[PDB]
Design a protein around this ligand. Structure first.
Ligand SMILES: *[C@@H]1O[C@H](CO)[C@@H](O[C@@H]2O[C@H](CO)[C@@H](O)[C@H](O)[C@H]2NC(C)=O)[C@H](O)[C@H]1NC(C)=O
Length: 532
């Protein structure tokens, strides 16, 4: 009367599993707005110094937007690529000075650079009709650094929340967390849209970042536990693919409404509405069984059978773990680093996450020039993931999990190396090769997440994935400084670093025990001899 066998008898993937997965997938998209980052909310458009006098002249004679930029603004390319033009204002009187459209400012100085440069007051004038966080508080020229501070604060919030949310998640149940985390994320999201100052915006975004990844991972583990042992691949990969669909939909709606306030206020509400379906999914049976709450576990199991409609097995009356466990099974950080096998697994998974994140950021950084339409570029970058799902979805159970993960982790680094060595000049090849690397990295991410979820004990499964995921955000934070510094020493030093990181990670993956078609562990001692 073990949990897995009774689950087989009552249907591994029945109509109950489909409904629960539909709801959790509806939750999946809610993580796209918080994960997409500052983009679509802090895009910096073209900007020049507003002048009062230009407004008068603009109507007097025929004008064009391109023409106004050229001979009304200070020229670019002096003492910097575009530092003068962006936020420097000549401050020559354009009002009550009728010098004709042909020669508005030429006559006075007989030269441009020598002209007198004043302060860039009167705020700024922006190109795009929409408004972003940059346009709101004028964080353009003097305070430009503030945007980087905002991004770094969000990332450090991710990093802290990764560690923090795990313990509150596993000790107090997987549905007490998913409910509270998504509720806090929703309330922070709407509260943000009414932020009048810059401090409140940062604080609310920090809270949302703290809670979002916890919500997403507690949603992931729940379905992974619910589904049968054999059908884990479909549930996990379709969860990731739902996340990708949510990303595409976010790009679409972002192009729909440019304004940041309305964008946030609209995209956040569906996460709040998801709360309306909290009553659909109950607590995971395995967690309850491991906590010694057997009556609730059997009650939940009977409900699954009733909705699925096959039959209730009479053996449930004696449902319990394989071996008579101890009264208390509290999750703690100390228990994570006791068994040598579990310690080795944790170290290997941490390194895997770190290398995956570093290689991803290196690839995106080393990409080609950005396209004219940011939205179209983001749409393509999201769409490049769909074939990854249909590649992985058919290979896991047929070939196992270690080999594809290792081979993709190797091929991503190989593609980075070939891009470094082979000509990087504008050609049709390079874009497609980069797409190959993108698909490799996406496969690595999804496979690492799945294997890490499957490898840990059930009673601390969430904590393990949280800890091993923190290094992902750590690497994402640190990589830009590393690549900037290394470039100074040698032109190609960062590329060698990325390639060696990828190769070493791919080599080290092989030692991780395989999990093809084996019931996920429920006891740390049992997980220790998983390979045996
Ligand atoms: C761009 O600005 C420059 C300003 O230098 C314009 O080109 C010349 O500007 C000098 C300075 O006033 C004039 O003496 C020349 O007569 C300008 N060129 C010509 C062909 O007359 C230029 O016209 C501006 N851009 C456009 C599209 O006209």
């Amino acid at each position: 009367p073990t949990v897995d066998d009774v689950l087989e008898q009552v249907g591994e993937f029945g109509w109950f599993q489909k409904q629960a997965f539909l709801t959790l997938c509806l939750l999946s998209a809610a993580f796209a707005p918080i994960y997409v980052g500052i983009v679509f909310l802090g895009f910096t458009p073209d900007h020049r110094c507003r002048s009062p006098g230009v407004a008068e002249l603009s109507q007097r004679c025929g004008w064009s937007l391109a023409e106004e930029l050229n001979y009304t603004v200070p020229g670019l390319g002096a003492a910097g690529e575009a530092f003068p033009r962006q936020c420097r204002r000549y401050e020559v009187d354009w009002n009550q000075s009728a010098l004709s459209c042909v020669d508005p400012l030429a006559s006075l100085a007989a030269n441009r650079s020598h002209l007198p440069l004043g302060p860039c007051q009167h705020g700024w004038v922006y190109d795009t009709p929409g408004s972003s966080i940059v346009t709101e508080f004028n964080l353009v020229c003097a305070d430009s650094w503030k945007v980087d501070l905002f991004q770094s604060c969000v990332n450090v919030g991710f990093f802290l929340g990764s560690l923090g949310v795990g313990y509150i998640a596993d000790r107090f149940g997987r549905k007490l967390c998913l409910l509270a985390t998504t509720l806090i994320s929703a309330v922070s999201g709407v509260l943000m849209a009414v932020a009048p100052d810059y401090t409140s915006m940062l604080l609310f975004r920090l809270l949302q970042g703290l809670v979002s990844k916890g919500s997403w991972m507690s949603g992931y583990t729940l379905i992974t536990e619910f589904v049968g042992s054999g059908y884990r691949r479909t549930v996990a990969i379709l969860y990731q693919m739902a996340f990708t669909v949510g990303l595409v939909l976010l790009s679409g709606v972002a192009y729909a409404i440019p304004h940041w306030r309305w964008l946030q206020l609209a995209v956040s509400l569906p996460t709040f509405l998801f709360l309306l379906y909290y009553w659909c999914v109950p607590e995971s049976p395995r967690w309850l069984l491991s906590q010694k709450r057997n009556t609730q576990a059997i009650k939940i199991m009977d409900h699954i059978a009733q909705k699925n409609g096959k039959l209730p097995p009479a053996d449930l009356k004696m449902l319990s773990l394989k071996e008579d466990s101890t009264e208390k099974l509290s999750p703690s950080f100390a228990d994570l680093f006791r068994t040598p096998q579990l310690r080795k697994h944790t170290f290997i998974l941490m390194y895997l996450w770190f290398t995956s994140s570093v290689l991803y950021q290196g690839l995106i950084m080393h990409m080609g020039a950005t396209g004219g339409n940011l939205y179209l570029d983001f749409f393509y970058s999201a769409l490049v993931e769909f074939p990854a799902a249909f590649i992985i979805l058919v290979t896991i159970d047929r070939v196992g999990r270690i080999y594809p993960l290792a081979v993709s982790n190797l091929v991503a680094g190989a593609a980075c190396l070939i891009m470094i060595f082979i000509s990087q000049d504008l050609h049709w090849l390079n874009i497609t090769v980069a797409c190959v690397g993108r698909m490799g990295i996406t496969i690595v991410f999804q496979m690492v997440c799945l294997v890490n979820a499957e490898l840990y004990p059930t009673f601390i499964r969430n904590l393990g994935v949280m800890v091993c995921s923190s290094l992902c955000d750590l690497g994402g934070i640190i990589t830009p400084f590393l690549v900037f510094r290394l470039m100074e020493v040698w032109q190609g030093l960062p590329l060698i670093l990325f390639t060696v990181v990828g190769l070493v990670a791919g080599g080290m993956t092989l030692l991780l025990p395989e999990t093809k078609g084996v019931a996920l562990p429920e006891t740390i001692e049992d997980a220790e001899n998983l390979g045996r």
